[PDB]
Motif scaffolding. Structure first.
Motif, mmCIF file in Angstrom:
data_model
loop_
_atom_site.group_PDB
_atom_site.id
_atom_site.type_symbol
_atom_site.label_atom_id
_atom_site.label_comp_id
_atom_site.label_asym_id
_atom_site.label_seq_id
_atom_site.Cartn_x
_atom_site.Cartn_y
_atom_site.Cartn_z
ATOM 1 N N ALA A 26 0.837 -1.193 0.000
ATOM 2 C CA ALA A 26 0.000 0.000 0.000
ATOM 3 C C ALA A 26 0.875 1.248 0.000
ATOM 4 O O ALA A 26 0.619 2.195 -0.742
ATOM 5 N N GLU A 27 1.913 1.240 0.833
ATOM 6 C CA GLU A 27 2.850 2.357 0.893
ATOM 7 C C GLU A 27 3.546 2.560 -0.449
ATOM 8 O O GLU A 27 3.676 3.686 -0.923
ATOM 9 N N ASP A 28 3.992 1.462 -1.052
ATOM 10 C CA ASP A 28 4.709 1.519 -2.320
ATOM 11 C C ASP A 28 3.819 2.085 -3.417
ATOM 12 O O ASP A 28 4.257 2.899 -4.221
ATOM 13 N N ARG A 31 3.456 5.821 -2.983
ATOM 14 C CA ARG A 31 4.669 6.612 -3.183
ATOM 15 C C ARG A 31 4.588 7.494 -4.430
ATOM 16 O O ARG A 31 5.164 8.577 -4.464
ATOM 17 N N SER A 32 3.867 7.036 -5.445
ATOM 18 C CA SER A 32 3.730 7.795 -6.684
ATOM 19 C C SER A 32 2.451 8.639 -6.691
ATOM 20 O O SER A 32 2.051 9.153 -7.734
ATOM 21 N N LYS A 33 1.816 8.775 -5.530
ATOM 22 C CA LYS A 33 0.555 9.505 -5.422
ATOM 23 C C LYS A 33 0.729 10.779 -4.600
ATOM 24 O O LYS A 33 1.826 11.099 -4.161
ATOM 25 N N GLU A 34 -0.368 11.494 -4.381
ATOM 26 C CA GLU A 34 -0.311 12.777 -3.698
ATOM 27 C C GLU A 34 -0.866 12.667 -2.282
ATOM 28 O O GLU A 34 -1.497 11.674 -1.923
ATOM 29 N N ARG A 35 -0.621 13.696 -1.481
ATOM 30 C CA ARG A 35 -1.142 13.750 -0.126
ATOM 31 C C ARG A 35 -2.642 13.487 -0.127
ATOM 32 O O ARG A 35 -3.373 14.035 -0.946
ATOM 33 N N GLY A 36 -3.095 12.641 0.793
ATOM 34 C CA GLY A 36 -4.515 12.417 0.980
ATOM 35 C C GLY A 36 -5.026 11.215 0.213
ATOM 36 O O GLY A 36 -6.089 10.688 0.516
ATOM 37 N N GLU A 37 -4.277 10.784 -0.792
ATOM 38 C CA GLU A 37 -4.656 9.593 -1.536
ATOM 39 C C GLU A 37 -4.462 8.392 -0.624
ATOM 40 O O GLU A 37 -3.609 8.409 0.267
ATOM 41 N N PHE A 38 -5.271 7.361 -0.836
ATOM 42 C CA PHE A 38 -5.390 6.289 0.139
ATOM 43 C C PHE A 38 -5.853 4.994 -0.508
ATOM 44 O O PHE A 38 -6.362 4.990 -1.626
ATOM 45 N N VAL A 51 -7.942 -1.517 7.267
ATOM 46 C CA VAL A 51 -7.017 -0.410 7.413
ATOM 47 C C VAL A 51 -7.192 0.538 6.245
ATOM 48 O O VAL A 51 -7.414 0.108 5.118
ATOM 49 N N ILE A 52 -7.111 1.832 6.517
ATOM 50 C CA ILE A 52 -6.982 2.805 5.450
ATOM 51 C C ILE A 52 -5.567 3.335 5.515
ATOM 52 O O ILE A 52 -5.175 3.949 6.499
ATOM 53 N N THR A 53 -4.786 3.062 4.478
ATOM 54 C CA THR A 53 -3.433 3.586 4.399
ATOM 55 C C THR A 53 -3.470 4.840 3.550
ATOM 56 O O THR A 53 -3.973 4.813 2.428
ATOM 57 N N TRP A 54 -2.960 5.944 4.081
ATOM 58 C CA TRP A 54 -2.969 7.195 3.330
ATOM 59 C C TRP A 54 -1.638 7.927 3.415
ATOM 60 O O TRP A 54 -0.839 7.696 4.321
ATOM 61 N N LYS A 55 -1.411 8.818 2.458
ATOM 62 C CA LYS A 55 -0.137 9.503 2.347
ATOM 63 C C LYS A 55 -0.207 10.889 2.971
ATOM 64 O O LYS A 55 -1.043 11.701 2.593
ATOM 65 N N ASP A 57 2.896 12.748 3.387
ATOM 66 C CA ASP A 57 3.951 13.480 2.707
ATOM 67 C C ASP A 57 4.916 12.494 2.071
ATOM 68 O O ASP A 57 4.673 11.286 2.069
ATOM 69 N N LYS A 58 6.010 13.009 1.529
ATOM 70 C CA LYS A 58 7.020 12.156 0.931
ATOM 71 C C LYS A 58 7.500 11.150 1.970
ATOM 72 O O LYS A 58 7.901 11.521 3.074
ATOM 73 N N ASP A 59 7.420 9.873 1.615
ATOM 74 C CA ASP A 59 7.857 8.785 2.488
ATOM 75 C C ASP A 59 7.198 8.816 3.867
ATOM 76 O O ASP A 59 7.768 8.339 4.848
ATOM 77 N N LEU A 60 5.993 9.366 3.944
ATOM 78 C CA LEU A 60 5.291 9.462 5.216
ATOM 79 C C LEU A 60 3.850 8.998 5.039
ATOM 80 O O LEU A 60 3.050 9.674 4.401
ATOM 81 N N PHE A 61 3.531 7.835 5.602
ATOM 82 C CA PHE A 61 2.202 7.247 5.461
ATOM 83 C C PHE A 61 1.632 6.857 6.816
ATOM 84 O O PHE A 61 2.372 6.545 7.744
ATOM 85 N N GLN A 62 0.311 6.870 6.924
ATOM 86 C CA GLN A 62 -0.346 6.438 8.147
ATOM 87 C C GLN A 62 -1.321 5.318 7.857
ATOM 88 O O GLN A 62 -2.002 5.318 6.835
ATOM 89 N N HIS A 63 -1.388 4.368 8.779
ATOM 90 C CA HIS A 63 -2.271 3.228 8.634
ATOM 91 C C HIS A 63 -3.379 3.312 9.683
ATOM 92 O O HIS A 63 -3.157 3.067 10.868
ATOM 93 N N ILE A 64 -4.566 3.691 9.232
ATOM 94 C CA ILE A 64 -5.712 3.893 10.112
ATOM 95 C C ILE A 64 -6.401 2.566 10.379
ATOM 96 O O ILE A 64 -6.867 1.914 9.458
ATOM 97 N N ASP A 65 -6.463 2.180 11.644
ATOM 98 C CA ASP A 65 -7.113 0.938 12.039
ATOM 99 C C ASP A 65 -8.630 1.112 12.116
ATOM 100 O O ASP A 65 -9.133 2.054 12.727
ATOM 101 N N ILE A 66 -9.352 0.194 11.489
ATOM 102 C CA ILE A 66 -10.807 0.192 11.520
ATOM 103 C C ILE A 66 -11.279 -1.107 12.155
ATOM 104 O O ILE A 66 -10.974 -2.195 11.661
ATOM 105 N N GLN A 67 -12.008 -0.994 13.259
ATOM 106 C CA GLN A 67 -12.572 -2.162 13.923
ATOM 107 C C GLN A 67 -14.003 -2.380 13.447
ATOM 108 O O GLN A 67 -14.807 -1.457 13.464
#
Length: 199
Positions: A26-28, A31-38, A51-55, A57-67
């Motif tokens: 998901a991160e990879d 990497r070729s996308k813009e901020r907020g893309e997920f 999980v929602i993985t979103w970007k 910034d450059k090389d900076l991603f967050q993985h949102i846990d959904i229960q």
């Protein structure tokens, strides 16, 4: 430890933004996308987690846990979804009310005059150099915490010869959490910080 995993027991979620990716993939992809893309994806383990993985910034991603709660069966999407201890009725609501608000607040911060781009070290050097221009005036800047996606550093010196202090601000979907309060905007966050110094 749960043997129901993304590798052994793959689920398909009926949403146009669901991908068969794991976390790394998901991160990879992002990497070729813009901020907020997920991407929405299955969690590495559990039949009741997405999980929602979103970007950010450059090389900076967050993985949102959904229960997922109120699942009809092991494969069905839960009829109730918990994110950050908050209730959502479906994936679109999470995307709009949670994710997009987090992106909105991210944009607000990095577009602020009080935000400084760069690594923690580069920002430290900048603040030190900057505080020595007007040695008697206090200085503070926010910057991105790359070690802990979703947090900012808040670095400040009372003056040129004072210690450089660093506090931690967490990005949330409703504002910026500093110490023990959630500030709805950067303006109010800056006012809060100045009030903290006076206690």
């Amino acid at each position: 430890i749960d043997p129901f995993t993304a590798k052994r027991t793959h689920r398909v979620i009926n949403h146009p933004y669901y991908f068969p990716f794991n976390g790394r993939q998901a991160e990879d992809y992002l990497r070729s996308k813009e901020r907020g893309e997920f991407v929405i994806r299955q969690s590495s383990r559990g039949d009741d987690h997405l999980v929602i993985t979103w970007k950010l910034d450059k090389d900076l991603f967050q993985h949102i846990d959904i229960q997922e709660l109120e699942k009809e069966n092991p494969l069905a999407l839960g009829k109730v979804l918990i994110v950050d201890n908050q209730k959502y009725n479906d994936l679109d609501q999470i995307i709009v009310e949670y994710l997009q608000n987090k992106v909105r607040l991210l944009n607000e911060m990095t577009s602020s005059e009080k935000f400084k781009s760069g690594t923690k070290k580069d920002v430290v050097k900048f603040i030190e150099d900057y505080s020595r221009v007007n040695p008697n005036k206090s200085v503070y800047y926010f910057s991105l915490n790359h070690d802990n996606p979703g947090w900012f550093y808040l670095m400040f010196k009372i003056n040129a010869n004072s210690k450089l202090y660093t506090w931690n601000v967490k990005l949330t979907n409703t504002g910026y959490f500093l110490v023990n309060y959630n500030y709805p905007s950067v303006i109010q966050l800056c006012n809060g910080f100045k009030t903290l110094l006076k206690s």
